[PDB]
Structure 1
């Protein structure tokens, strides 16, 4: 349902966690560079954690694409969804986290009228 795109290569599927994020509860897993003079992570000793650098940058052909091959576009209503009328093979809609379930039944109904993909069609369903 998407365009023909190459094989998506990530080069690092592992999340860059902070050094000693597991050792303390105060040190969150959100990445921060080590600034220490004696840090083996800043010095890149062998056996230590890998650091984010530009070589892990994803391919410019397959950046920002979902595994379905579309770029996710956030949608708040019927009007923002209809921007993806003539762009169904490039972009896919995602209904936002705060759209109520009396409105998402309208948005999914208009998405299937234009054939627009919705990547979260099960949100807030009253089954």
Structure 2
């Protein structure tokens, strides 16, 4: 279906959580750097959470690729779909959340006609 690509490896599947986001409800899981000078997490003591850094970066050849081997492209209409007439083995359509079911069937039909992969079918279409 998609193009052959190198085998995808991520170097960090686990999420980067903020310190004490488990301890307090007011502290959310969104990452925030600890600026404290007395901070063991900033000082990188043994037995502490990992911090994000560029060493964890993904390979450029496999970046922005889902396991199918496609880069996701958001679509709201058949005109945005027909942008990917050529690029069927590299890109995959994802219908936007705000779209309705009477237009989703149109988009899916045109995607079938053009030979495009749609990432989120069966959306508002169980009937």
Shorter-chain TM band: over 0.9
For residues 46-96 of structure 1, the C-alpha deviation after alignment (integer angstroms, 9 at most, x for no partner) is 100000000000000000001100000000100000101000000000000
Superposition deviation, residue 17 in structure 1:
0.4
Calculate the TM-score normalised by the size of structure 1. Answer: 0.99
CA distance in 1, matches of 2:58, 2:126: 39
* Structure 1 vs Structure 2 CA RMSD: 0.6
Superposition deviation, residue 126 in structure 1:
3.7
Q: SS in structure 1 opposite 2:106?
A: helix
CA distance in 2, matches of 1:89, 1:96: 21
Which contiguous aligned blocks of 4+ residues in structure 1 show a shift greater than 4 angstroms? none
Calculate the TM-score normalised by the size of structure 2. Answer: 0.99
CA distance in 1, matches of 2:126, 2:13: 35
For residues 29-61 of structure 1, the C-alpha deviation after alignment (integer angstroms, 9 at most, x for no partner) is 000000011111000001000000000000000
Structure 1, unaligned stretches of length 5 or more? none
CA distance in 1, matches of 2:105, 2:126: 10
Superposition deviation, residue 108 in structure 1:
0.4
